[PDB]
Amino acid sequence: CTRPNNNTRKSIHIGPGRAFYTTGEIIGDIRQAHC
């Protein structure tokens, strides 16, 4: 587990082009949430 996701800490870099935070990252965050 990890606690980004619920505050999306490891994924802020971009923003306007939201889906440019990258699959690996969003999926990583979502994996990390499976607690």
From Swiss-Prot:
Disulfide bond entries: C1-C35
Source domain of life: Viruses
Localization (cell): Virion membrane; Host cell membrane; Host endosome membrane
Residue ranges of the region described as V3: 1-34
Sugar-modified residues: N6
Membrane topology, as annotated: Peripheral membrane protein; Single-pass type I membrane protein
Oligomeric form and interacting partners: The mature envelope protein (Env) consists of a homotrimer of non-covalently associated gp120-gp41 heterodimers. The resulting complex protrudes from the virus surface as a spike. There seems to be as few as 10 spikes on the average virion. Interacts with host CD4, CCR5 and CXCR4. Gp120 also interacts with the C-type lectins CD209/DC-SIGN and CLEC4M/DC-SIGNR (collectively referred to as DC-SIGN(R)). Gp120 and gp41 interact with GalCer.
Function: Attaches the virus to the host lymphoid cell by binding to the primary receptor CD4. This interaction induces a structural rearrangement creating a high affinity binding site for a chemokine coreceptor like CXCR4 and/or CCR5. Acts as a ligand for CD209/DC-SIGN and CLEC4M/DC-SIGNR, which are respectively found on dendritic cells (DCs), and on endothelial cells of liver sinusoids and lymph node sinuses. These interactions allow capture of viral particles at mucosal surfaces by these cells and subsequent transmission to permissive cells.
Protein name per Swiss-Prot or TrEMBL: Surface protein gp120
Interval of the full protein contained in this chain: 294 to 328 of 848
